[PDB]
């Protein structure tokens, strides 16, 4: 059964970009899925997206432009203390200038860079190069 909708969405997006597809469709939409896409847009990894309302937790269509190498979700969302940031980036990201994590915090869903600026930790969601 669908345990993690975000995992399904990020696997659909990564698969689409490996094939060079222009746009992809995600069937179950969520707040967390929308927030993850917004973080990826602020770094200009996806052009934009639209949300269709099907009265049944509608679908999302995401436009991709040759820039998203891999976006993946992280299984059980570990409680990331502020001191554990660089330990996670050293493991999940390619270098110190390229990628960005995604964390869910009381101040919303933010990447590692601005969560460090806001001085707040939380559960880790995923990443993208």
């Amino acid at each position: 059964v669908r345990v993690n909708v975000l995992a399904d969405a990020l696997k659909s997006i990564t698969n689409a970009e490996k094939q060079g597809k222009r746009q992809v469709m995600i069937r179950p939409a969520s707040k967390v899925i929308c927030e993850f896409l917004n973080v990826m847009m602020k770094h200009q990894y996806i052009t934009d997206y639209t949300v269709v309302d099907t009265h049944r937790s509608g679908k999302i269509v995401v436009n991709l432009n040759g820039r998203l190498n891999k976006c993946a979700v992280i299984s059980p969302r570990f409680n990331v203390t502020l001191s554990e940031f660089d330990k996670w980036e050293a493991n999940l990201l390619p270098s110190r200038h390229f990628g960005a994590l995604v964390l869910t915090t009381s101040y919303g869903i933010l990447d590692n860079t601005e969560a460090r600026a806001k001085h707040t930790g939380g559960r880790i969601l995923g990443f993208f190069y």
Partner: protein
Amino acid sequence: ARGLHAARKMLAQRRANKWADKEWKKGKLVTRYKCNPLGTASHAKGLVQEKLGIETKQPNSGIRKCVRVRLLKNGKKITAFVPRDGSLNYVNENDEVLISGFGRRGHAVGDIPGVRFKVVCVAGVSLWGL
């Protein structure tokens, strides 16, 4: 069990799966104190009682000189090599010797037919300097 609250099974699986480690189980179960003639000791002392010569394996030829030792701490009977050239003539009978291991090879080592122990002293100094 890769979940966030699944720490009971993850910890319990490593307890069970660790018993299949041949090198790790041997050092934990109670056999070093009953089935080891040397025991935990690195070196052991015993009395020489018989001078022996063991033939080597098939792809080799010759007689491996060695001695039979009766240890003090336990009382078991073992066989001990006599290191380098012509060192068996230096070893007398009914005297105390220091017996100390070998590498461990595929368990047995260098006098071929099952010997795993080498005489390092003859009461004296060394079945080296001697």
